């Protein structure tokens, strides 16, 4: 049951990039569900204003990675992933923006990766609209916090 908090700082600049229709695609560092365990990372988009149905959305995907333990682990990957954008206000007035997905073992995304990062990710194109960001204190000190929680075994 691994937990990873991805600290995306200098966020105003990424936002200014998105506003100017310059793509923003970032990857979290790789993290392990355990030692031994699977290696995963997240991929985050700020969809461009010109991007058809998902313009101005944060996209958030989980990616499978080649890990030190891959030959000892069962494949394909199976579990429950919780993706959360953290509301950085004090606990009384706090509401995180969150989704829960089931890593279905039949997706290409959860087969054993054969390159450093599996290009097939799994997540939400329209995970959170950029304007929802301004509705609570999700950005604090120029930093967005993206938490990933993997329930596996």
């Amino acid at each position: 049951n691994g937990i990873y908090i991805w600290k995306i700082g200098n966020f105003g600049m990424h936002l200014k990039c998105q506003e100017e229709e310059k793509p923003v695609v970032i990857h979290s560092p790789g993290f392990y569900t355990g030692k031994p365990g699977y290696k995963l990372c997240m991929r985050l988009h700020l969809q461009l204003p010109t991007a058809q149905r998902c313009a101005n959305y944060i996209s958030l995907f989980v990616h499978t990675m080649q890990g030190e333990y891959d030959s000892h682990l069962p494949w394909p990957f199976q579990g429950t992933i919780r993706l959360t954008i953290l509301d950085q206000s004090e606990a009384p007035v706090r509401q995180n923006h969150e989704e829960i997905m089931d890593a279905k073992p039949e997706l290409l995304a959860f087969q054993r990766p054969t390159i450093p990062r599996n290009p097939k990710g799994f997540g939400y194109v329209t995970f959170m609209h950029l304007e929802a960001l301004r509705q609570r204190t999700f950005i604090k000190d120029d930093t967005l916090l993206v938490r990933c929680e993997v329930s596996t075994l």
Binding site: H63, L107, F122, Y124, T126
Partner: peptide
């Protein structure tokens, strides 16, 4: 009540 999706990062 929102479904996750497979997304190839190279279809950019």
């Amino acid at each position: 009540s929102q479904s996750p999706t497979e997304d190839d990062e190279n279809e950019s």
